[PDB]
């Protein structure tokens, strides 16, 4: 019959879950955001649309930290994104409290995954309207991840989601080929700012504000921090240059 | 179409929309206009109060949450009471436990997360009210715009409610000017009254019809009504 | 969420009727007929076994007559499974009364309880009602021999003679025709078998399709006796009464 | 989350039918044939092992289950439903009887317990009835040997012999002819194998058939000695070998 | 009870006596107080047998599950689970536990978890009623990074003195060597260690 | 009335559509897998398809280590796959703790099958769109293969296959056994059993494989492990020098 | 109470006395302190008699269900773990002191549990008030690699040490042999060294001796 | 103090040739104060008898409980419960209150209707079953009863003899206990009939 898309945990005749697929639609409609895995850390960047001159610049930070070594950025329904991070912080806290060691990124990834996958098991809940790029440095180096509303997630070299996810993916795939020997945190920051600028074309209507953060063993000491001041402007320039 | 996906908030429309949230969002547009703007020393709220008859009163639009924080509403009056009361507790908790004034940026994050909970769980309904929050904390003066969808934003100024686009354009135009009205409250308030008047139509702002609130450096959040606002009409 | 699949088993019709109770009754109407006839010196219970076979073991079988107490028994019409659930709570209720007051439970007190349980599934809970109708036959020192009836609705009433299940209209008419206040147990026993014999959908009223019980005050004692006839006892009484 | 399905999923239709139960019964009909036969000194229950792949090992899957050392069960319908039913049945025999009286429950009572569990899945909130019908065969000191059938409705009845599943109508008829109140266990086992044959399409051997009986006590199967009153389990599942040896004199 | 754990050049060694008591009665003279919670994370139990066993049995369960989800757990992590249990339940436990483990990056580590539920990482640790009599001896004989031979000796000597003075200690001396090479169980009888 | 297709309740035909649709989801990954039993080892092969260049291939897998001895390969979407793996791991740890011995492959399979059976009967729980294949060298039963589906069904196998081309692999294997007459691969080393497994996968599917096209898990007495791209390659080179 | 456990080259045997007491009074002169958990897993218990029986049947019941569920023979380590975790949960309030033994797919086993939940493992064990008397015998005659008969002698001798030297122990000797290959053999009253000597006189009273105030028949028929 | 010593009283059972006997005193006092000499402590459900010494309130309570349980048992089993089974029911019922037991000393006596074998059993307050083949004693004068029985008793006594023996055991034991006596009653049980007699004893 039909109407297999009105309730959440329902399987359509061809084995799908439309409610989750509709969630993806909310994600695709969101701002573009990415993640680049350099050789001793990870870099996170995101598009902040200037809906008006009235928005205080730099004042509406999107990227979020979990614990002291993990970074999270998402596209789609912001509130849903925060909700997931709050869970992540709880999960990270619970883990550390018992095992002492701060949560390994791979462990954290499944914590988020199981949680999100949980929201596709009942009709009394709605799936998450966000795709999330996250990662950090742990006992075994750097790890970059992307989680989908379906609860699906994998490890990435480069990741992008949102409005300009195609431009981004194109650009990210290029990098991968032109750097078989890895990329540096400093270089990933620059490259990231650029990828965001290019991917801004599929939204060239409103003006935007760039935001970058990173977690590098050598640059931030395994801790997650926001790229600001001179290093930030410098990346904006490098991007503003190649965009011309 | 829509009719099949707007029966609750636990359902996404084929295009990724949440209609129940959108309908709630509508209740705000139907509400009386209110404005918010801030310099580096103060933050101001100006709201148009609405009445039923002429034998009735004018429903209050501004609520104080603490000595350094307050807001103005547009939409379901009850919900504003609920949310503002929640904001009062959070302010109170921050003081009692940490002897710390709740940062406006934080208050915003809290509201956002509280709202979000009624948009992903069956049985709950989104809040049907918009809120403009102003406050003076350790990083200065602030202005926030809260939407029932959970989206909270920090701005220099803004307006919500019927015909609000009027004032919002004015502020978006006056920006460079009012954001510098430091050390002069009466000037910021006047800029606020001039902003809100851009959303008038029916009548003009009278004394028991206008409502203004202010918070700043050495200024505990205070509301002005009636004759108190006469000097601005 | 769930609301979508809620049948709402406990609501009024625009006419002020309880759909499920009505439908439950509709179900009962297709159940083997059960008859209760009360005489001056005893009570009689007779029921027609619905669905029988050469292979169906009958000495071990019971599907319509259950002993609740030593002085109380019921005849069932409807879902046996549902009936058992109620029957057991009834047996417990009687024992509790006995433990609390050191006196056998008065017949109506037991009936009102069971009826109350049913009534509940009618006003709250969102569950379906029990598809059962009971004919109660019992004795106590306050009202002597009594005959009651309760159905899915949760209402009960007293009777001199009554039938439940299929062809009750027919059965009721025939009883209304030959029942007389001054009847004697054996008189009642015959009237019972005759009525069934006339309403039966089968060819002949053979013993292998009947369950029989009598609550008579065995004169040689001074106390009341409950007796559920065995296959042969029913086969005998069936010959005497003149149905061979 | 939280199961919001607190209302019945099985209700009365205007005609007085309880759909889900009817449908459940339908599922039973589609199931593989299984039967039971009570002799004067034993009971036998059997069914066909419809291996669903030549790569599957049919021994790793039993349709005939021991509930107590004197009671066994077999079904027709949904295998998984039956499986969880067997676990519940084995546990209830303990928690609701052996732990109170120090002895295993008599057949009718255990059957009565299983029946209840099924009745509840017919009225409780948020569930569907069980898609199976069972044939319980056992023995207790004061009731001797017995055979019972339990339906998705929760109803149960005692049988001299009967069959359920696919060819129940046909099998039942073949049994009504061959049965008599003088059969010895071996005879019932034979009638059993004959009855089952008709319902079986291809292969018919000790590997495609599953049959167990409730008969004499098996001290040899006890596992220990020294306690006079403990003489052994009456339930015994025939072996592939034992089945074939019989099929030769079939 | 006399139990100790010493970290040396190639890893770490755990040692213990084998006497369990109930009053003056030796309930068991061949007790094994060296318990395994993981491949190369073991512990030494002192205090209540019932309590330490129950605790160990649980930690083992937690580390097994931890492994299934996030691979191998550190020695630190194992000490953390023990501590969590001993601290949170301090009012109903009498367990003095020593956690010793070998890992490829840290050699061997030793964490002592005393009655309170506090944790203490150390070069070596001693505990149990017998330990009091060898505080001086051990302080004057322990050296960091000794060889496996020196360590086995240091432990054999220390515990023999503990067994000598403390009546709650006795039987055989048991050892467990944890190094990159694997796990080795050592056992020393009275006749051997008594005359040291 | 037409909702007997949205929740796990019966249809007039006595069917459970939601369960059938669940099975449909198991093929979403478009990956096949097969398991065979050695003389004293058990091997599971599964296709691996990582077409995206941005993915870290090493983080992609449908094979899981439930315990030192139990290994599990999943056919179906990764999120349900992981939900299932996590539960099984917990079920395994808990069992060991309570009963004092390592949970057997077949038992874990039964426990998971029962769990699946419930989603089949309880309306608020949806079945998981996955088919679980559990393998190990049980201390009592030897090499073992037990697979469970969204129906709550399960059974042991001599060998088995799952995925879009399950039928091809199955009949291929059925044949090899009709030939050998034994219920397992008469091979002492697991490397050879792995090779046999990959060989027949190729025959039945008519496809050649590179070291990055497969995923392999091996279960031996007291240990289940997976192979590396190189462990595979070496094993792939081996089959090459036979043809 | 005296209960012991002794391993022999191909199995394990457990024994116990049969005296039950309440203070200095013998409650039962022939109770059974040997409990069957599963066909080949028996347990000897000391302490609060009702407790040794109840906890023993509880785990036994669960072992039975587990066995049916897993389709495997019960294992002693399972009975051991289930028992100890139970006793531990009850902070020693269940006065059970047990010696659990048996054979299973993994071999023959011998353990002991204490009321608070700790467990031991060995080749010979003893518990109960006769604990020390029995252990002296075992410490004096156990040797590695004993034959089924040697073990039974030793176990039986240890119980006697209790019966004769411990006031809390007495009467008969109950044994149970669990050999790796065969069925477990329970030997109830394997030894009965305490038969009461023939009484000096019969105290059979001449009828009519007791003065009766009133009489009547009781109705047992319903 | 000791709850089982507030009211007083004793019960005793014995096996004879194809018969069983069970007797009890009739006293129910409050410490030294005698209150009732009509407090029988023997009850029966079908052909199974149950005597109960201890705290009166619990004696009453347990009887009402076992009646409840035996009645439901008959309705479901469709037969009267046997001695052995009932003993189990009594045991589990008591142990269910392991850490807050009824202060009673239950005694069961009866003849297995299917085997005709005589049966008697005693229990401690938490269910510990003592199934003796000769006799069972319970109550504040149990020591005396043990002394009486251990001497007076001898196997296979005929009903008429068993009666003398059990009555003498009870009578002389109660006369040495300040809390027992004030009248006794004795049940002689055979397959066919059951006789009840009240004994004549000291009233001090
Ligand atoms: C190490 C010795 C110690 O560290 N401390 C001395 C206390 C001993 C604990 C343990 N033995 C027992 O717990 C024994 N039971 C027991 O002592 N019970 C108490 C009693 O006095 O009877 C009760 C609780 C009042 C028994 C269970 C073995 C022991 O020997 N500890 C050793 C080592 C850790 C085994
Ligand atoms: C083994 C002897 C011992 O190990 N210990 C001596 C204590 C005896 C226990 C048992 N007898 C009883 O438990 C008696 N009941 C009892 O003591 N009940 C307590 C009470 O204080 O009245 C209640 C539980 C608070 C009675 C049942 C005989 C005994 O004889 N132990 C033997 C062996 C295990 C039977």
Strand partners, C214: C44, C227
- In angstroms, rounded to a whole number, what is the distance separating the alpha carbons of residues A95 and A89? 10
- Torsion angle (degrees, nearest 10) of CA G205, G208, G209, G215: 120
G45 lines ligand 2 (CB under 6 A): yes
Q: Could you tell me if F115 lies within 8 Å of chain C, comparing CB atoms?
A: no
Domain boundaries, chain D: 1-250
Q: Return the CATH class of domain H1-204.
A: alpha beta
Order across the sheet with D71-77: list the strands: D65-68, D71-77, D132-140, D144-150, D156-158
Domain boundaries, chain H: 1-204
Q: Residue E43: give its domain's CATH number.
A: 3.60.20.10
Please give the number of the atom of ligand 1 that sits closest to the Cα of E23: 21
Name the one residue in this structure whose structure tokens are 């350099």: A38
Closest by CA position to H152, among listed H172, H138, H174: H172
Instruction: Work out the minimum CA distance from B193 to partner chain C, whole angstroms.
Output: 47
For the CA of G84, the nearest ligand: 1
Distance from Cα H171 to the centre of ligand 2, integer Å? 28
R_g over Cα of chain G? 21
Q: Could you tell me if A2 lies within 8 Å of chain D, comparing CB atoms?
A: no
Distance from Cα G50 to the centre of ligand 2, integer Å? 8
- Asked: is C1-244 a CATH 1.20.1250.20 domain? The reply is no
Q: Residue F61: give its domain's CATH number.
A: 3.60.20.10
Contact A225, A75 (CB under 8 A): no
Closest by CA position to D234, among listed D101, D96, D127, D137: D137
Chains contacting H (3 or more CB pairs within 8 Å) = C, D, G
Q: Which residue of B has its CA nearest to A29?
A: B16
In a 3-state reduction of DSSP, which class is residue B219?
A: strand
Contact C28, C165 (CB under 8 A): yes
Paired sense of beta strands D224-225 and G184-191, if any: parallel
CA separation, residue H73 to residues B135, B194, C91, H69 (Å): 75, 89, 11, 6
Show the tokens assigned to A129. Answer: 């309207």
- List CB contacts (< 8 A) between E74 and chain A: 101
- In angstroms, rounded to a whole number, what is the distance separating the alpha carbons of residues D17 and C128? 12
Q: Tally the domains of chain F.
A: 1
Distance from Cα E126 to the centre of ligand 1, integer Å? 18
For the CA of G130, the nearest ligand: 2
Nearest residue by C-alpha to atom 9 in ligand 1: E48
Give yes or no: E1 in active site. Answer: yes
G35 lines ligand 2 (CB under 6 A): no
Which residue in G88, G122, G132 is closest to E50 by CB distance?
A: G88
Domain boundaries, chain C: 1-244
- In angstroms, rounded to a whole number, what is the distance separating the alpha carbons of residues C67 and C73? 4
Order across the sheet with E173-179: list the strands: E124-127, E3-8, E11-16, E173-179, E182-188
Q: Which fold has domain A1-244?
A: 3.60.20
Closest by CA position to D159, among listed D140, D178, D141, D145: D145
Name the one residue in this structure whose structure tokens are 């200690």: E169
- In angstroms, rounded to a whole number, what is the distance separating the alpha carbons of residues G169 and G2? 6
Q: How many Cα atoms occupy the beta-carbon half-sphere of A77 within 13 Å? A: 31
E27 lines ligand 1 (CB under 6 A): yes
How buried is residue F115: exposed, middle or buried, by Cβ count under 10 Å (0-12/13-18/19+)? middle
Strand intervals (E) in chain B: 34-38, 42-48, 62-66, 69-75, 129-137, 140-146, 152-154, 157-160, 210-216, 219-225
Closest by CA position to F66, among listed F94, F33, F26, F27: F94
Chains E vs C: touching, with 3+ CB pairs under 8 Å?
A: no
Instruction: Looking at C106-167, list the stretches that DSSP marks H as alpha helix, in order from N- to C-terminal side.
Output: 107-123
Contact E69, A110 (CB under 8 A): yes
| Segments forming the whole domain that contains residue F116 | 1-243
Chains F vs G: touching, with 3+ CB pairs under 8 Å?
A: yes
E47 lines ligand 1 (CB under 6 A): yes
Distance from Cα H126 to the centre of ligand 2, integer Å? 11
Q: Could you tell me if H160 lies within 8 Å of chain G, comparing CB atoms?
A: yes
Order across the sheet with A64-66: list the strands: A64-66, A70-76, A130-138, A141-147, A153-155
Which residue in F12, F117, F155 is closest to D60 by CB distance?
A: F155
Contact D4, D121 (CB under 8 A): no
Q: Which residue of F has its CA nearest to D9?
A: F9
Contacts of B35 (CB under 8 A, 6+ apart): B45, B46, B47, B132, B157, B158, B159, B164, B167, B171, B192, B195, B196, B199
- List CB contacts (< 8 A) between A122 and chain C: 1
Which of E3, E24, E45, E49 maximizes ligand 1 atoms within 8 Å of its Cβ, making it the mutation to test the pocket?
E49
- List CB contacts (< 8 A) between D5 and chain A: none
- In angstroms, rounded to a whole number, what is the distance separating the alpha carbons of residues G81 and E56? 13
In a 3-state reduction of DSSP, which class is residue D10?
A: coil
- Residues D130, D135, D138, CA angle at the centre, nearest 5°? 130
G2 lines ligand 2 (CB under 6 A): no
Nearest residue by C-alpha to atom 3 in ligand 2: G47
- In angstroms, rounded to a whole number, what is the distance separating the alpha carbons of residues G185 and D199? 46
Q: Return the CATH class of domain G1-222.
A: alpha beta
- What is the 3-class SS of chain F, one letter each residue? CCCCCCCCCCCCCCCCHHHHHHHHHCCCCCCCEEEEECCCCEEEEEECCCCCCCECHHHCCCEEECCCCCEEEEECCHHHHHHHHHHHHHHHHHHHHHHCCCCCHHHHHHHHHHHHHHHHHECCCCCCCCEEEEEEEECCCEEEEEEECCCCCEEEECEEEECCCHHHHHHHHHHHHHHHCCCCCCCCCHHHHHHHHHHHHHHHHCCCCCCCCEEEEEEECCEEEECCHHHHHHHHHHHHCCC
Contacts of G108 (CB under 8 A, 6+ apart): G7, G10, G11, G12, G101, G102, G178, G179, G180
How buried is residue A124: exposed, middle or buried, by Cβ count under 10 Å (0-12/13-18/19+)? buried
H126 lines ligand 2 (CB under 6 A): yes
Contacts of C162 (CB under 8 A, 6+ apart): C35, C36, C135, C147, C149, C172, C175
E73 lines ligand 1 (CB under 6 A): no
Contact E158, E126 (CB under 8 A): yes
Distance from Cα E99 to the centre of ligand 1, integer Å? 20
Taking phi over 0 as left and psi of -120 to 50 as alpha, with beta for the rest, G107 belongs to left
- List CB contacts (< 8 A) between G65 and chain D: 90-91, 94
Name the one residue in this structure whose structure tokens are 């009687």: C94
CB contact under 8 A, D142 and H114: yes
What's the farthest any 2 CA atoms get from each other in chain G? Answer: 70
Contacts of B130 (CB under 8 A, 6+ apart): B28, B31, B73, B74, B75, B145, B146, B147, B148, B160, B161
Name the one residue in this structure whose structure tokens are 């009237």: C191
| Segments forming the whole domain that contains residue E52 | 1-196
Structure method: X-ray
Please give the number of the atom of ligand 1 that sits closest to the Cα of E52: 34
- In angstroms, rounded to a whole number, what is the distance separating the alpha carbons of residues A111 and A115? 6
Residue A216: CB atoms within 10 A of its CB come to 25
Closest by CA position to A227, among listed A211, A216, A242, A204: A211
In a 3-state reduction of DSSP, which class is residue D52?
A: coil
Instruction: Work out the minimum CA distance from E46 to partner chain F, whole angstroms.
Output: 22
D to F CB pairs, distance under 8 Å: 103
Q: How many Cα atoms occupy the beta-carbon half-sphere of B20 within 13 Å? A: 21
CA separation, residue G9 to residues C176, G80, G143 (Å): 86, 22, 11
Paired sense of beta strands E34-38 and E173-179, if any: unpaired
In a 3-state reduction of DSSP, which class is residue A116?
A: helix
Chains F vs E: touching, with 3+ CB pairs under 8 Å?
A: yes
In a 3-state reduction of DSSP, which class is residue C168?
A: helix
In a 3-state reduction of DSSP, which class is residue C154?
A: coil
Chains contacting A (3 or more CB pairs within 8 Å) = B, C, D, E, F
Instruction: Work out the minimum CA distance from C126 to partner chain F, whole angstroms.
Output: 15
How buried is residue C174: exposed, middle or buried, by Cβ count under 10 Å (0-12/13-18/19+)? buried
- List CB contacts (< 8 A) between F107 and chain G: 69-70
Name the one residue in this structure whose structure tokens are 């990056």: E105
Distance from Cα G20 to the centre of ligand 2, integer Å? 7
Contact E43, E99 (CB under 8 A): yes
Name the one residue in this structure whose structure tokens are 């409050």: H30
Q: Which fold has domain D1-250?
A: 3.60.20
């Amino acid at each position: 019959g039909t109407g297999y898309d009105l309730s959440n945990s329902v399987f359509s005749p061809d084995g799908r879950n439309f409610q989750v697929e509709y969630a993806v639609k909310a994600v695709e409609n969101g701002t573009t955001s990415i993640g680049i895995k350099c050789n001793d850390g990870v870099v996170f960047a995101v598009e902040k649309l200037i809906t008006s001159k009235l928005l205080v610049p730099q004042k509406n930070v999107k990227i979020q930290v979990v614990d002291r070594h993990i970074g999270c950025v998402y596209s789609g329904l912001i509130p849903d994104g925060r909700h997931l991070v709050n869970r992540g912080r709880e999960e990270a806290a619970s883990f550390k409290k018992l095992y002492k060691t701060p949560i390994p990124i791979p462990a954290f990834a499944d914590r988020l995954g199981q949680y999100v996958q949980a929201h596709t098991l009942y009709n009394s809940v709605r799936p998450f309207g966000v795709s999330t790029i996250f990662g950090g440095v742990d006992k075994n180096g750097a790890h970059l991840y992307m989680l989908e509303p379906s609860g699906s997630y994998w490890g990435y070299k480069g990741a992008a989601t949102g409005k300009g996810r195609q431009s981004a993916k194109a650009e990210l795939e290029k990098l991968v080929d032109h750097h078989p020997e890895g990329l540096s945190a400093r270089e990933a920051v620059k490259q990231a700012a650029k990828i965001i600028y290019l991917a801004h074309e599929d939204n060239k209507e409103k003006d935007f504000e760039l935001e970058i953060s990173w977690c590098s063993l050598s640059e931030t000491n395994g801790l997650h921090k926001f790229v600001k001041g001179d290093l930030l402007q410098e990346a904006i320039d490098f991007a503003q240059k190649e965009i011309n | 179409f829509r009719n099949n996906y707007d029966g609750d908030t636990v359902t996404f429309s084929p295009t990724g929309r949440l209609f129940q949230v959108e309908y709630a969002l509508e209740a705000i547009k139907q509400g009386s206009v209110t404005v918010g703007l801030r310099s580096n020393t103060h933050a101001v709220l100006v709201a148009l109060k609405r009445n039923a008859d002429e034998l009735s009163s004018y429903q209050k639009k501004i609520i104080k949450c603490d000595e350094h924080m307050g807001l103005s509403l547009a939409g379901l009056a009850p919900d504003a009471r609920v949310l503002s009361n929640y904001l009062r507790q959070q302010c109170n908790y921050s003081s009692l436990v940490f002897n710390r004034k709740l940062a406006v940026e934080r208050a915003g994050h809290l509201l956002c997360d509280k709202a979000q909970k009624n948009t992903q769980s069956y049985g709950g309904r989104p809040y049907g009210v918009g809120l403009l929050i102003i406050g003076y904390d350790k990083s200065g003066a602030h202005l926030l715009e809260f939407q029932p969808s959970g989206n909270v934003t920090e701005l220099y100024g803004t307006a919500i409610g019927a015909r609000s686009q009027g004032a919002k354009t004015y502020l978006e135009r006056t920006l460079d000017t009012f954001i510098k009205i430091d050390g002069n409250p009466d000037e910021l308030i006047k800029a606020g009254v001039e902003a809100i008047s851009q959303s008038l139509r029916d009548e003009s702002l009278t004394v028991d019809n206008l409502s203004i609130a202010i918070v700043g450096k050495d200024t505990p959040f205070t509301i002005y009504d009636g004759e108190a606002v006469a000097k601005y009409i | 969420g769930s609301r979508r699949y809620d049948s709402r088993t406990t609501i009024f019709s625009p006419e002020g009727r309880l759909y499920q109770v009505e439908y439950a009754l509709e179900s009962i109407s297709h159940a083997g007929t059960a008859i209760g006839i009360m005489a001056s010196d005893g009570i009689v219970l007779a029921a027609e076994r619905k669905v029988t076979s050469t292979l169906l073991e009958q000495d071990t079988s019971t599907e319509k007559l259950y002993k609740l107490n030593d002085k109380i028994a019921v005849a069932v019409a409807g879902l046996t499974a549902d009936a058992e659930i109620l029957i057991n709570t009834a047996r417990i209720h009687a024992q509790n009364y006995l433990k609390t007051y050191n006196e056998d439970i008065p017949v109506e007190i037991l009936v009102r309880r069971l009826s109350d349980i049913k009534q509940g599934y009618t006003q709250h809970g969102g569950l379906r009602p029990f598809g059962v109708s009971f004919i109660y036959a019992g004795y106590d020192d306050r009202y002597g021999y009594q005959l009651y009836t309760s159905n899915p609705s949760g209402n009960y009433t007293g009777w001199k003679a009554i039938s439940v299940g299929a062809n009750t209209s027919a059965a009721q008419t025939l009883l209304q025709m030959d029942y007389k206040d001054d009847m004697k147990v054996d008189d009642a026993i015959e009237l019972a078998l005759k009525t069934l014999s006339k309403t039966t959908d089968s060819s002949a009223l053979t013993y292998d399709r009947l369950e029989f019980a009598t609550i008579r005050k065995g004169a040689n004692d001074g106390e009341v006796y409950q007796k559920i006839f065995k296959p042969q006892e029913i086969k005998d009484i069936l010959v005497k009464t003149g149905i061979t | 989350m939280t199961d919001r399905y607190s209302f019945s999923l099985t209700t009365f239709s205007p005609s007085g039918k309880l759909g889900q139960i009817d449908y459940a019964l339908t599922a039973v009909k589609q199931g593989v044939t299984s039967l039971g036969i009570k002799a004067t000194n034993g009971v036998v229950i059997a069914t066909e092992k419809k291996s669903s792949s030549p790569l599957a090992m049919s021994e790793t899957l039993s349709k005939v289950s021991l509930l107590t050392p004197d009671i066994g069960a077999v079904y027709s319908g949904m295998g998984p439903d039956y499986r969880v039913l067997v676990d519940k049945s084995r546990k209830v025999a303990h928690t609701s009887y052996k732990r109170i009286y120090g002895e295993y429950p008599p057949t009718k009572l255990l059957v009565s317990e299983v029946a209840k569990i099924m009745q509840e899945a017919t009225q409780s909130g948020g569930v569907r009835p069980f898609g199976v019908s069972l044939l319980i065969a056992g023995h207790d000191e004061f009731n001797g040997f017995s055979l019972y059938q339990v339906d998705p409705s929760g109803s149960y009845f005692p049988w001299k012999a009967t069959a359920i599943g696919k060819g129940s109508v046909a099998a039942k008829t073949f049994l009504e002819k061959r049965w008599n109140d003088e059969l010895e266990l071996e005879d019932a086992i034979h009638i059993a194998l004959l009855t089952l044959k008709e319902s079986v399409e291809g292969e018919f051997n000790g590997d495609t058939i599953e049959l167990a009986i409730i008969g004499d006590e098996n001290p040899d199967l006890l596992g220990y000695t020294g306690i006079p009153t403990d003489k052994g389990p009456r339930f015994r599942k025939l072996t592939s070998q034992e089945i074939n040896d019989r099929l030769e004199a079939l | 009870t006399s139990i100790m754990a010493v970290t040396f050049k190639d890893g770490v060694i755990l040692g213990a006596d084998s006497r369990t008591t109930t009053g003056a009665y030796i309930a068991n003279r061949v007790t094994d107080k060296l318990t395994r919670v993981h491949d190369k994370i073991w512990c030494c139990r002192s205090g209540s047998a019932a309590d330490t066993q129950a605790i160990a049995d649980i930690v083992q369960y937690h580390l097994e599950l931890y492994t299934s989800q996030y691979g191998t757990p550190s020695t630190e992590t194992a000490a953390s689970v023990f501590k969590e249990l001993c601290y949170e339940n301090k009012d109903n436990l009498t367990a003095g536990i020593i956690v010793a483990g070998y890992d490829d990056k840290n050699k061997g580590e030793v964490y002592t978890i005393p009655l309170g539920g506090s944790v203490h990482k150390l070069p070596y640790a001693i505990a149990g009623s017998g330990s009091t009599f060898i505080y001086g001896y051990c302080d004057k004989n322990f050296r960091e990074n000794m060889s496996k031979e020196e360590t086995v000796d240091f432990i054999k000597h220390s515990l023999s003195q503990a067994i000598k003075w403390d009546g709650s200690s006795g039987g055989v001396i048991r050892m467990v060597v944890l190094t990159a090479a694997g796990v080795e169980r050592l056992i020393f009888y009275p006749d051997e260690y008594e005359q040291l | 009335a037409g909702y007997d297709r949205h929740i796990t309740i019966f249809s007039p035909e006595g069917r459970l559509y939601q369960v059938e649709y669940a099975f449909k989801a198991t093929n979403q990954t478009n990956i096949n897998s097969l398991a065979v039993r050695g003389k004293d080892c058990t091997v599971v092969i599964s296709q691996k398809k990582v077409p995206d260049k941005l993915l870290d291939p090493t983080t992609v897998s449908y094979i899981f280590c439930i315990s030192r001895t139990i290994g599990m390969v999943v056919n179906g979407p990764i999120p349900d796959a992981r939900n299932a793996a996590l539960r099984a791991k917990a079920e395994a740890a808990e069992f060991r703790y309570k009963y004092g011995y390592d949970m057997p492959c077949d038992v874990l399979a039964k426990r998971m099958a029962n769990l699946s059976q419930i989603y089949t009967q309880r309306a608020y729980m949806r079945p998981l769109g996955v088919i679980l294949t559990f393998v190990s060298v049980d201390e009592e039963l030897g090499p073992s293969i037990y697979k469970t589906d969204p129906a709550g069904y399960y059974v042991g196998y001599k060998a088995t296959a799952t995925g879009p081309k399950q039928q091809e692999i199955t009949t291929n294997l059925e044949n090899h056994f009709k030939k050998s007459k034994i219920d397992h691969i008469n091979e002492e080393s697991w490397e050879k059993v792995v090779e046999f497994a990959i060989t027949h996968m190729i025959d039945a599917l008519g496809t050649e494989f590179s070291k990055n096209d497969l995923e392999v898990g091996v279960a031996t007495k007291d240990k289940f492990f997976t192979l590396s791209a190189e462990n595979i390659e070496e094993r792939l080179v081996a089959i090459a020098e036979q043809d | 109470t005296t209960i012991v456990g002794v391993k022999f080259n191909n199995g394990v045997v457990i024994a116990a006395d049969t005296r039950s007491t309440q203070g200095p009074i013998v409650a039962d002169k022939n109770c059974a302190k040997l409990h069957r958990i599963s066909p080949k897993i028996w347990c000897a218990g000391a302490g609060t008699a009702a407790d040794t029986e109840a906890v023993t049947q509880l785990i036994g019941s669960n072992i039975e269900l587990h066995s049916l569920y897993t389709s495997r023979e019960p294992r002693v380590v399972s009975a051991l773990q289930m028992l100890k975790q139970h006793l531990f949960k009850y902070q020693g309030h269940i006065g059970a002191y047990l010696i659990v033994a048996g054979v299973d797919p993994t071999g023959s086993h011998l353990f002991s549990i204490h009321a608070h939940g700790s467990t031991d493992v060995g080749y010979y064990l003893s518990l109960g008030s006769g604990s020390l008397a029995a252990m002296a015998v075992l410490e004096s005659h156990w040797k590695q690699d004993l034959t089924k008969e040697e073990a039974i002698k030793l176990a039986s001798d240890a119980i006697q040490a209790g019966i004769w030297n411990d006031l809390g122990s007495g009467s008969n000797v109950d044994v149970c042999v669990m050999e790796i290959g065969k069925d477990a053999e329970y030997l109830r009253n394997y030894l009965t060294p305490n038969v009461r000597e023939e009484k000096q006189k019969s105290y059979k009273f001449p009828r009519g001796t007791t003065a009766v105030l009133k009489e009547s028949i009781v109705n047992i028929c319903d | 103090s000791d709850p089982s010593s507030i009211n007083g009283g004793i019960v005793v059972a014995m096996t004879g040739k194809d018969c069983v006997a069970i007797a009890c005193d009739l006293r129910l006092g409050s410490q030294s104060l005698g209150v009732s000499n009509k407090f029988e402590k023997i009850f029966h459900y079908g052909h199974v008898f149950l005597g109960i010494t201890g705290l009166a309130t619990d004696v009453t309570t347990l009887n009402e409980m076992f009646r409840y349980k035996t009645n439901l048992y008959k309705l479901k089993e469709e037969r009267a419960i046997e001695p052995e089974t009932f003993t189990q029911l009594v045991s589990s019922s008591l142990y269910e209150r392991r850490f807050g037991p009824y202060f009673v000393g239950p005694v069961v006596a009866g003849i297995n209707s299917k085997s005709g074998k005589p049966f008697i059993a005693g229990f401690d307050l938490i269910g510990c079953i003592d199934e003796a083949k000769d006799f069972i004693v319970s109550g504040t004068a149990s020591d005396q009863l043990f002394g009486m029985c251990e001497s007076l008793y001898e196997p296979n006594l005929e009903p008429e003899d068993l009666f003398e023996t059990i009555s003498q055991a009870l009578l002389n034991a109660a006369d040495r206990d300040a809390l027992s006596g004030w009248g006794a009653v004795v049940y002689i049980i055979k397959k066919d009939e059951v006789v009840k007699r009240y004994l004549k004893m000291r009233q001090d």
